[PDB]
Write a protein that binds this ligand. Structure first.
Ligand SMILES: C=C[C@H]1CN(Cc2ccccn2)C(=O)[C@@H]2CCC[C@H]1N2S(=O)(=O)c1cc(Cl)cc(Cl)c1
Length: 107
């Protein structure tokens, strides 16, 4: 599954739901490894629409637990990320992922 651990608090009121456009900054890391990607490298925020399965399941379930303004750590098991296959060259097989996510706004 996905574990959500808060780093810094959001508004405690505005939590995204299916069909909303969520704007975030994030860093993605392998558990027991290093960073593999971040939004903040280019500084252009990452945008996605919740509940359209355009991001991994752990994001779908974990970002839905975040409110606007919040920064949280998401720990995502392989079955909620990229499973047995991964994405060779960036995410290995059977990888647990850790993300530092900051939910900026709904757009
Ligand atoms: C590239 C940005 C996305 C990619 N996706 C969607 C997705 C789309 C197609 C293939 C793999 N993943 C995702 O679901 C998640 C979570 C949202 C932020 C980013 N990733 S990510 O795990 O950091 C990532 C980032 C990058 Cl550069 C490549 C991969 Cl294969 C995965």
């Amino acid at each position: 599954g996905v574990q959500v651990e808060t780093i810094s608090p959001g508004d405690g009121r505005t939590f995204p739901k299916r069909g909303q456009t969520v704007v975030v900054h994030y860093t993605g890391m392998l558990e027991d490894g290093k960073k593999f990607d971040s939004s903040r490298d280019r500084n252009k925020p990452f945008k996605f629409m919740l509940g359209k399965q355009e991001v991994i399941r752990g994001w779908e379930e974990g970002v839905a637990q975040m409110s606007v303004g919040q920064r949280a750590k998401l720990t995502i098991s392989p079955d909620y990320a990229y499973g047995a296959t991964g994405h060779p060259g960036i995410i290995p097989p059977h990888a647990t992922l850790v993300f530092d996510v900051e939910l900026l706004k709904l757009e």
